[PDB]
Amino acid sequence: VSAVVGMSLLALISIFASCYMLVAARSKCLTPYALTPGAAVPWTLGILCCAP
Amino acid sequence: GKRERMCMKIENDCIFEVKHEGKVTGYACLVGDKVMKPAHVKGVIDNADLAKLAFKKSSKYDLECAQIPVHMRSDASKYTHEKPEGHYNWHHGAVQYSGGRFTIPTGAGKPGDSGRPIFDNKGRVVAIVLGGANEGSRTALSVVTWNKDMVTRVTPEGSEEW
């Protein structure tokens, strides 16, 4: 029981950390385009990441 | 003269002010279809409608941006991206630009005056003042540009954050 609980917890924290850091990478790649007045994100980068 | 009067005429409607403890401590501007607000200054914008609006933050570039609603759409600042060399207007005198650097005469920039945009000869806005560093009778400027699609910060050594 203890081993299963520990393994599940470790898998969950690994998945969460990976997802959060990938989200951070997205948000840091697409952060300057929201600050530039006018202009627009390229369609390719706006497809490989969801760009509002 | 007339140019000073027209500069004041725009400034009475385009540039806003932030306040804290009953004292104004920063100026926010509306450029293009966004808002610029240097991120070192904290306070409540002296406008009910803009304050309720949700912001965005990036401490790398020391600015806060957003999207304007549709009832100040006409009150734009006519952005531009070209940087020929010459002289450029500002609320605190005429600033000249040469060698990729902005220069001001000594102590014409005051503490707490950050956020005021610069104007070119055609009146378009080219950068936002963030801070300054002095050398001799001239003081260098730390401003953020709008080169193409990516904003870029340029800062001299020992810059004092206004």
Swiss-Prot record, chain B:
The active site is at residues 40, 62, 114. Residues 84-94, 120-124 are annotated as: Dimerization of the capsid protein. Residues 14-162 form the Peptidase S3 domain. Residues 1-14 are annotated as: Ribosome-binding. The record marks 88, 121 as: Involved in dimerization of the capsid protein. It is found in: Virion; Host cytoplasm; Host cell membrane; Host nucleus. Disulfide bonds join 14-29. A motif (Nuclear export signal) lies at residues 45-55. Residues 56-61 are annotated as: Interaction with spike glycoprotein E2. Forms an icosahedral capsid with a T=4 symmetry composed of 240 copies of the capsid protein surrounded by a lipid membrane through which penetrate 80 spikes composed of trimers of E1-E2 heterodimers. The capsid protein binds to the viral RNA genome at a site adjacent to a ribosome binding site for viral genome translation following genome release. Possesses a protease activity that results in its autocatalytic cleavage from the nascent structural protein. Homodimer. Homomultimer. Interacts with host karyopherin KPNA4; this interaction allows the nuclear import of the viral capsid protein. Interacts with spike glycoprotein E2. Interacts with host IRAK1; the interaction leads to inhibition of IRAK1-dependent signaling. The N-terminus contains a nuclear localization signal and a CRM1-mediated nuclear export signal. The C-terminus functions as a protease during translation to cleave itself from the translating structural polyprotein. This is Capsid protein. The chain holds residues 106 to 267 of 1253 of the full protein.
